[PDB]
Structure 1
């Protein structure tokens, strides 16, 4: 619930973020048109979501930083670092949507699918990434955690890109080979493509801002955070096909994209020799009839009920990890995050 009481101030900070990023134009009028494009990119791709990853930085900041140190400037920096996380997210999603041939995101047409944008979105994505470091220098350059944050964001990007590489390599277009969709491969993919930037990153950022830079403290937090991230991507895969379109704001493409989704992995582990053949002949193709066939097989194997059971077991597992690794950090930090991802 701490997220709702911090959201407003966090979202209102976006205006300032845009202002500060588009104030590099006054000193260099010649790049005005580029700065205008940037503003359009930011407003279209950084706004429209729930902002939970960025909000996590803020929430954790206020729970880790002693009130007497939560001055106006410190809070400002916290809101900025939180937006940097949202920008990192935006950067990856713009590119991910092109690579996954997606149609919508956050209830609107994907940026690259917008008339007049197309592949220019690739550079737009690179600009969003660049903005992260511009804001860090502008707001935190004099802070003792400056270098830690720069390296954290850079490291998190590398891990995410390694993950994306695995994601794409395991899903060759027009090349269906179910044998590569194993539980071990799946866990490695999601750990790198989602767990680091969506969960470890936000909390780690707040920790560094709070002066908590101990390798041990970060390792223990990551123990909890990477497990939550795994659950989050599984839930993401589930929703890709069984989620309510009006709620997810995006059209699923995992089956058509031949992805190593939690669903197909669960399918292969429960499928009979016959069902296996059906999956093999209908997976990884654009034909709506073939996709529908795969979904029918998943429903026949009660995958939705399987996911619901996994969600409960996962929840209990994550809570167990919190009892073990939260200390010396306030359990609320992890509990609040968990409450946000589990229903």
Structure 2
């Protein structure tokens, strides 16, 4: 609800985001061609998602800030910083698709896969990253929270990258002894939860003057837990989701991923059952993948998940009770609804 209410004004803002990033000056003729490429990059990779992360910036700013202080310009800064989050995401995905050898993304040929692009997408990804800071300069350099947001984004980049390293180390080689629960939790926190859940809320907080380290730590405690659950639910749905509801068809098992499902399987399986999996984890051949699906069902994992989901909701609600103050608990509850839904 509160997110379909913001979405038109947020997607309309993108046009302006591109105008000012691609604003080719009459004293810098000869980069035009390069700026033309930049626009193409932005248009292909920053659009076509659901925009949940960037929208969360905008929704949180509306719950955090006295409506008396939500002038046009403040709102516009909120949309801009929400766009910065989407650009951070776009930088990571263009680059991860290259690394994974992915084919599609958001049902569209991955950018690096287009003819004429290739490994040049490395630089394109780096430009997406840079755009973040250009935007924060342009829209926010005079604000008191400016440096807070630069450091936020930079930290968020570092965490995600470091998470990405751990993910890469963890799946070089089928060696399933690498796929510990500890290790799974740690990949999720670094690689996806900091930027997906902490970052957008933290950004809004800084924009609203809330810059305390305890405040931030309390929000972080709640949000990293949410982020763990979201990814767990994602791993689950990769296999048992309906592609109609999810809009993703899942290949986790072919891609020998450190998925929550694989992790639970290995905590639970007799030495015999280790072996069936050790066999079918990764082959393309569909009867390979189908025989892990059926093992997952035979280990009652869909129910393990359902117990984990209830457990998780109870914990989140306790975290919110304890650590939301002095933020409105709605900030968190609105997110919880978006992902326990």
Q: Superposition RMSD on alpha carbons, in Å?
A: 1.6
- Deviation of 1:147 after TM superposition, in Å, equals 0.4
Cα pair distance change 1:116/1:306, threshold 3 Å: farther
Cα pair distance change 1:109/1:296, threshold 3 Å: farther
- Deviation of 1:198 after TM superposition, in Å, equals 0.3
Cα pair distance change 1:287/1:95, threshold 3 Å: farther
What is the rounded CA distance, in whole Å, between the counterparts of 1:157 and 1:73 in structure 2? 27
Tell me, which stretches of 5 or more residues in structure 2 are unaligned? none
What is the rounded CA distance, in whole Å, between the counterparts of 2:324 and 2:235 in structure 1? 28
- Deviation of 1:294 after TM superposition, in Å, equals 2.1
- Deviation of 1:304 after TM superposition, in Å, equals 2.4
Tell me the TM-score normalised to structure 2 length.
0.95
Aligned to 2:214: 216
- Deviation of 1:158 after TM superposition, in Å, equals 0.2
Match of 2:325 among 304, 324, 327: 327
Between the two proteins, the alignment pairs up a number of residues equal to 341
Aligned to 1:103: 103
Shifted more, 95-104 versus 218-227: the winner is: 95-104
Is this contact kept in 2: 1:103–1:251, CA < 8 A? no
What is the rounded CA distance, in whole Å, between the counterparts of 2:219 and 2:194 in structure 1? 11
What is the rounded CA distance, in whole Å, between the counterparts of 1:96 and 1:248 in structure 2? 21
Shifted more, 38-47 versus 292-301: the winner is: 292-301
- Deviation of 1:177 after TM superposition, in Å, equals 1.3
Tell me, which stretches of 5 or more residues in structure 1 are unaligned? none
Shifted more, 71-80 versus 270-279: the winner is: 270-279
Is this contact kept in 2: 1:170–1:260, CA < 8 A? yes
Cα pair distance change 1:121/1:128, threshold 3 Å: same
What is the rounded CA distance, in whole Å, between the counterparts of 2:24 and 2:304 in structure 1? 52
- Deviation of 1:140 after TM superposition, in Å, equals 0.2
Higher-RCO chain (CA-CA 8 Å, sequence separation at least 6): 1
Shifted more, 161-170 versus 265-274: the winner is: 265-274
Shifted more, 75-84 versus 251-260: the winner is: 251-260
What is the rounded CA distance, in whole Å, between the counterparts of 1:248 and 1:29 in structure 2? 46
Cα pair distance change 1:149/1:177, threshold 3 Å: same
What is the rounded CA distance, in whole Å, between the counterparts of 2:330 and 2:265 in structure 1? 36
What is the rounded CA distance, in whole Å, between the counterparts of 2:26 and 2:264 in structure 1? 55
What is the rounded CA distance, in whole Å, between the counterparts of 2:135 and 2:245 in structure 1? 32
1:225-278, Cα deviation, whole Å (9 max, x unpaired): 000010111112222233333454444343233221101001111212221101
What is the rounded CA distance, in whole Å, between the counterparts of 2:220 and 2:310 in structure 1? 21
Is this contact kept in 2: 1:104–1:251, CA < 8 A? no
Tell me the TM-score normalised to structure 1 length.
0.95
- Deviation of 1:165 after TM superposition, in Å, equals 0.6
What is the rounded CA distance, in whole Å, between the counterparts of 1:170 and 1:27 in structure 2? 49
SS of equivalent to 1:102: coil
Aligned to 2:229: 231
Is this contact kept in 2: 1:25–1:35, CA < 8 A? no
1:53 aligns with 2:53: yes
